[PDB]
Ligand binder design. Structure first.
Ligand SMILES: [Ca+2]
Ligand SMILES: [Ca+2]
Ligand SMILES: [Ca+2]
Ligand SMILES: [Ca+2]
Ligand SMILES: [Cl-]
Length: 190
């Protein structure tokens, strides 16, 4: 059989970048060459393992990639189509809605982090929640929320959204201070 190893079906690329194509051949007969196609159009052919091709500066649109091994006895075997997409990529945006920088929090108490996320061209796949740069949880469904067991001291809470192209937003962050659990005092309210 002949397999296209990369890219994988359904992969999305950015307009103007390159698509590099790799094929593996399994056959009892030695391979003369592997031809690489986009639809019916020959990209290029490769007489040597590893079998590679490259579409340089790919324009937007669908690419229907196939590899064909030409074997030493004249036979041809072919991969299935690997269909990929080249598009304009537009990163999502994220906004941290809680906590605020002046949050009153204590060590060991759970503190709810919340965010909104938007993608202008596509959709949000998930929001990741981070504390001092470390992912503590993800939420795949709006509303975006995570309950963090608070850790005493100064911490930076951030969120990063990921879209359906796996493009990440820039992070949105807040700096907070978490008090020692022993310093929780009465505070009047109504
Ligand atoms: Ca080669
Ligand atoms: Ca997007
Ligand atoms: Ca949720
Ligand atoms: Ca903000
Ligand atoms: Cl503490």
């Amino acid at each position: 059989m002949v397999t296209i190893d990369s890219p994988v079906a359904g992969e999305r690329f950015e307009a103007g970048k390159d698509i590099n194509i790799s094929a593996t051949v399994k056959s009892k007969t030695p391979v003369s060459k592997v031809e690489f196609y986009n639809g019916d159009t020959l990209i290029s052919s490769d007489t040597t393992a590893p079998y590679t091709a490259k579409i340089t500066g790919a324009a937007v649109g669908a690419y229907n990639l196939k590899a064909v091994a030409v074997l030493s006895d004249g036979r041809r075997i072919e991969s299935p189509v690997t269909p990929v997409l080249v598009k304009v990529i537009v990163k999502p945006t994220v906004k941290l809605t809680a906590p605020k920088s002046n949050v009153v929090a204590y060590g060991n108490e759970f503190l709810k982090i919340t965010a909104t996320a938007s993608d202008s061209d596509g959709k949000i796949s998930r929001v990741d929640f981070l504390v001092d740069g470390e992912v503590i949880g993800s939420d795949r469904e709006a509303p975006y929320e995570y309950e963090w067991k608070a850790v005493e001291g100064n911490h930076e809470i951030s969120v990063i959204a990921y879209d359906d192209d796996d493009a990440a937003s820039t992070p949105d962050s807040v700096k907070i201070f978490v008090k020692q659990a022993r310093l929780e005092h009465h505070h009047h309210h109504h």
